[PDB]
Design a protein around this nucleic acid. Structure first.
Ligand SMILES: [Mg+2]
Lengths: 430, 236
DNA sequence: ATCGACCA
DNA sequence: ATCGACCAGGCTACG
């Protein structure tokens, strides 16, 4: 069973669930946009004020009117968000104080989200503003200088995917067999931000791709990694459990990723201790079946496939490198209307099973269920319409790390995440 | 020796090149670990023993076979040490440890090649599957170097020092030399196939092999590497 | 920061 | 990011 350096392909047919009980196929942006505009997203966000603030420095600009135009029509026609008005706030000068004034002015009027335009590529200003907004209101940033030479129709309708998600909406979820897969998947690990400092993360997902809870540790040194890794994971399950008391977690999977201290034996030890402690504390089932997997997009392997598929392997290909390590093809060239697209070479994902408490008879059966699940989770991405060559359990922590590292590097506002409920349950990182 | 028969349309290929012949028994000799020990060729620390092998063997030694778990631990490093004595010009050794790294300056013409130096870097590891199956994993990076300095220059500083135009064309050139894009910076239909041909070509040149196979010499016996990417079949 | 990739 | 994206029919764009 499971012969090595052979390959098996995930059984296909996975679909999205977009609302009105409608299912569209994956890997077809045209079908998804058609479905969204006929049946809406899986969940239109319920808003307080039905009001969105647009902040910019261009008074009576034509492109600002075209932008506001595309936003207003597509938010109603594609995403079925009705009766939204867009109030404009002009900041006199492109500096933090001036822009923060208009931001705070927009908060005082009562808005559900802030769409802010900035003139150029200013990394410190962007992250100081982003960290401020993250602690206050859902926000979506834009650059004036780039939307000049873009087709604003593709620019806006792609931009709205993450903004609808930031407002609490649910663009689409995965259609998954309820009898297979994990009850929850915990993406956890850590990411170095300096040569010396790092932070731990843990993010709880349903098998349908939705994020239920997420926590980050404070910025610490590598000597404190294992301690905060255990504390971070326990706090995300606490938050998951209090918001889902009715959920007996009987199968659990841990997706460990991130460039982190090289303590694999110690990390596995502590992670197994954490699950046992959660068992004692009745956060998961007393007889929970679980597995710990290491997911890495960085590795030296490349896989070449069919000449009719741009010499690429097909989606869901599972190559067995060795007894407990696999290469998973998450993404492939996709049919567009007039033929197959041209791609730069696509690298597979390395998956290593590190620990489990399964019996020998169910081992290989369970391994391929969570390998299939890793591929399925690679089809959940609310950052836009194009697919990401990462499972959501690794993609979203990487987005969190990009904000944390840059805010720490350029001097933005601290996230203060544990206190805010919105930050724990909303994809503020998109 | 050990012969690997059929090691591994619907056929896939991986950047692992099989060592179909290798000595089934090797000479190994162990000594207690000492804290002044520093890693190097022909020795490998395993726990609190330091195993000597290959040219590090002198008088007193044990002989272990591919059935022993210790064989794979040592042969994975002893392989790279052997390959490191077989580098052909213009390739040079850059680094040797648990990974073997070779470099050559790219001499094909590319605009801005009087200020910016480019170098293929083959990154070589050893894969150990089944119980008796070994192969070399080869990846390819391209290093960007300021020719004045012979020192690494990032994409940011090139734009700073030499202008944004220069950086753009250098990036496109690296992608072209990687066979990820056309020399014109455009995605094309055979990129993955041409990338695999480039790996196989640079690898055969780095170890002075003109042909599909090549045999190398070890004190225990002769190794034989087949310079064709490993095949992956769909399970029955 | 539209996003999508990608040495250590 | 060096670049361009997505529907059926057919105003070959837009949807
Ligand atoms: Mg974003």
């Amino acid at each position: 069973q499971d012969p090595m350096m052979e390959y098996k392909i995930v059984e296909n047919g996975l679909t999205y669930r977009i609302g009105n009980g409608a299912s569209v196929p994956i890997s077809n942006t045209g079908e998804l946009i058609k479905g969204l505009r006929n049946y809406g997203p899986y969940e239109v966000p319920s808003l307080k004020y039905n009001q969105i603030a647009l902040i910019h420095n261009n008074q009576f600009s034509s492109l600002i009117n075209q932008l506001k135009s595309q936003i207003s029509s597509k938010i109603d026609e594609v995403w079925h968000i009705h009766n939204i008005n867009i109030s404009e706030f002009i900041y006199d000068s492109p500096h933090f104080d001036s822009i923060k004034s208009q931001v705070d002015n927009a908060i005082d009027t009562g808005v559900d989200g802030i769409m802010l335009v900035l003139p150029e590529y200013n990394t410190p200003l962007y992250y100081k503003l982003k960290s401020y907004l993250i602690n206050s209101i859902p926000s979506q940033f834009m650059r004036y200088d780039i939307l000049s030479n873009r087709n604003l129709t593709f620019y806006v309708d792609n931009l709205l995917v993450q903004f609808v998600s930031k407002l609490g909406g649910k663009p689409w979820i995965l259609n998954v067999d309820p009898e297979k897969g994990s009850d929850i998947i915990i993406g956890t690990g850590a990411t170095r931000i300096d040569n010396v400092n790092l932070f731990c993360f843990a993010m709880v997902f349903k098998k349908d791709g939705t994020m239920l809870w997420n926590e980050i540790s404070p910025i610490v040194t590598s000597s404190e990694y294992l301690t905060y890794l255990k504390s971070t994971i326990k706090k995300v399950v606490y938050g998951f459990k209090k918001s889902n008391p009715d959920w007996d977690v009987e199968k659990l999977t841990l997706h460990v990723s991130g460039k982190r201290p090289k303590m694999k034996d110690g990390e596995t030890k502590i992670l197994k201790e954490t699950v046992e402690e959660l068992k004692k504390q009745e956060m998961v089932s007393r007889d929970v079946k679980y597995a710990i997997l290491h997911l890495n997009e960085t590795h030296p392997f490349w896989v070449m496939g069919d000449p009719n598929n741009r010499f690429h392997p097909y989606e869901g290909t599972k190559v067995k490198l060795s007894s407990k390590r696999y290469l998973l093809t998450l993404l492939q060239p996709y049919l567009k209307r007039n033929g197959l697209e041209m791609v730069t070479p696509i690298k597979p994902l390395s998956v290593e099973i590190v620990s489990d408490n399964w019996t020998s008879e169910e081992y290989y059966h369970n391994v391929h269920e969570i390998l299939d699940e890793i591929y399925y989770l690679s089809k959940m991405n609310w950052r836009g319409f194009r697919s990401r060559n990462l499972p959501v359990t690794v993609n979203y922590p990487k987005l969190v790390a990009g904000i944390i590292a840059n805010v720490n590097r350029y001097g933005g506002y601290p996230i203060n995440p544990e206190g805010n409920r919105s930050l724990q349950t909303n994809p503020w990182f998109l | 020796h050990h012969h690997s028969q059929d090691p591994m349309s619907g056929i896939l290929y991986i950047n692992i090149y099989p060592i179909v012949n290798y000595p089934e028994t090797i000479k190994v000799s162990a000594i207690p670990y000492y804290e002044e020990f520093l890693p190097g060729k022909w020795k490998k620390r395993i726990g609190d023993l330091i195993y000597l092998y290959g040219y590090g063997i002198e008088n007193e030694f044990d002989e272990i076979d591919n059935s022993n778990a210790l064989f794979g631990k040592i042969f994975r490093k002893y392989l790279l040490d052997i390959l490191s004595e077989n580098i052909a010009t213009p390739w040079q050794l850059k680094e040797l440890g648990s990974t073997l790294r070779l470099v050559k300056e790219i001499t094909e013409n590319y605009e801005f090649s009087n200020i910016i130096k480019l170098q293929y870097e083959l990154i070589i590891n050893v894969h150990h599957w089944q119980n008796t199956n070994f192969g070399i994993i080869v990846d390819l990076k391209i290093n960007i170097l300021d020719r004045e300095n012979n020192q690494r220059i990032s994409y940011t500083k090139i734009k700073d020092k030499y202008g944004e135009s220069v950086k753009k064309k250098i990036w496109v050139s690296v992608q072209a030399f990687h066979r990820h894009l056309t020399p014109e910076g455009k995605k094309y239909a055979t990129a993955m196939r041409d990338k695999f041909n480039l790996l196989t070509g640079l690898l055969k040149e780095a170890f002075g092999s003109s042909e599909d196979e090549k045999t190398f010499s070890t004190p225990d016996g002769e190794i034989k590497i087949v310079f064709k990417p490993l095949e992956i079949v769909e399970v029955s």
